[PDB]
Amino acid sequence: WVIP
């Protein structure tokens, strides 16, 4: 999971 990432900060887009």
Add this chain to the structure above:
Amino acid sequence: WVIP
């Protein structure tokens, strides 16, 4: 396009 890339070499996978």
Add this chain to the structure above:
Amino acid sequence: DSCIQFTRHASDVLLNLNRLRSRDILTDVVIVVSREQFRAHKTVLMACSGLFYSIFTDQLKCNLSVINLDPEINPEGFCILLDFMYTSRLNLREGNIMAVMATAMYLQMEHVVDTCRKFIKASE
């Protein structure tokens, strides 16, 4: 093999599937979550959820145009997860995390369940 790979292809496909969903094109099922209805493509739901994969591979349920979810399922939690299925983006907030995690557990979306568990653990 000796194939070449187009890096953005999977993302471009999913973007177009979401555009078809937004315009209600070739949607073949309505998911009923208490008073709320959500139109979708059975193939995308199966590709994202262990629950929908089991439902639509069933020889009788594969032909249904309406699927009713368990009354304990929260429509907003479902909406957030349906948006995630079609975009890869999850709108996870303090006010919805419990409903999102419970819905992801029911839908069998293990990567979502995992990030919800981690976000909850950090707040404890």
Add this chain to the structure above:
Amino acid sequence: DSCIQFTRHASDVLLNLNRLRSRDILTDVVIVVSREQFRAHKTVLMACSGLFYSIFTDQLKCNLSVINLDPEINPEGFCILLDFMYTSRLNLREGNIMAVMATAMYLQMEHVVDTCRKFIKASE
């Protein structure tokens, strides 16, 4: 927004759509290319091809279960492009590049047309 994004989600969706295609699950169209037949999902074909997008948004053609391609289309070139649609991997070889490029032009798959043009230019 304040969404989080699952990096591998689009690739995982496409992998599962290809698994459904391999098991002939919820395929809703057969593409006829001379003597050869290819089963697929209309939504995936539309998401990958300008030609299929135009065909399946047409109010009469959207309901057809069989689509016949132009007789000049090579079945192997089509097969390679159908595999690319469902995997992001293109099996481009000296022996098939001309057929693949012509099929990609007909199907309106601009990124494929682009890499074929570049590979041909390098060999000149």
